[PDB]
């Protein structure tokens, strides 16, 4: 969860610091990012289960 939040912040900095698109384009990209999230947050937990168990087993 903490990682995800850090990555979002960095992007925002880049957009503001760097040359920017149109407002409409930008607004959308942010919406576009959101859609992936909801599946992802369930996915991120699932990711967690696999690797640390595979690490623990070995």
């Amino acid at each position: 969860p903490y990682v995800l939040g850090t990555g979002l912040i960095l992007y925002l900095l880049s957009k503001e610091i760097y040359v920017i698109t149109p407002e409409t384009f930008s607004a959308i990209s942010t919406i576009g990012f959101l859609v992936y999230i909801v599946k992802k947050y369930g996915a991120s937990v699932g990711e967690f289960a696999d690797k640390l168990n595979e690490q623990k087993i070995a």
């Binding site: 990682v3 610091i17 959308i28 919406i31």
Partner: protein, 217 residues
Amino acid sequence: ITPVILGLPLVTLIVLFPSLLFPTSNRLVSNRFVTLQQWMLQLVSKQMMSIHNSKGQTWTLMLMSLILFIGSTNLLGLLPHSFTPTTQLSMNLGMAIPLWAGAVITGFRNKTKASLAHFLPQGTPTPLIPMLVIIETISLFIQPMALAVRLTANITAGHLLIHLIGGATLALMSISTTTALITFTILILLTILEFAVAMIQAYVFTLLVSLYLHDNT
């Protein structure tokens, strides 16, 4: 200065944290933090290692660094905007030398006259025909190295067309949003479906090609 100078350092640091964080995960902590990020290179060492070795461990991590660097570089052009039209193009040209040099390191440096002697002796290039070996030295390097520049420009365009079609769709239907929002919504998501995928597959080409080099090397 700051903008151009800030962009390349910024790129590095996003790859650097994963590249530091995973080395770090080899004993601590993990809490939430370390294990979370170990996830990043474990996705690299999970996902990309499903393709690698393959060429063998020796080259494997050498190429995976460029693959991750390209995908991460383009992810660092994904997010920032404006960034793709300028900085990602300068990063595509800054990835151009790495893409050229990736064949150079072992191919042209050890055999410039026939870097296909490392890459592909018999295949595309005719091994019976050193002329076709040098000709396809372009289609397996000189060009493929220009393609790797065109490949990022292929992404730039598709990313651009999303912005242009987007901005043109919202410029066309400045309704607030309304029906253009629905399509415009897609047009952004097309940025991921187009650039962020084809970007990836783009470095995947440099992967596989520098694999087919070092795998026969």
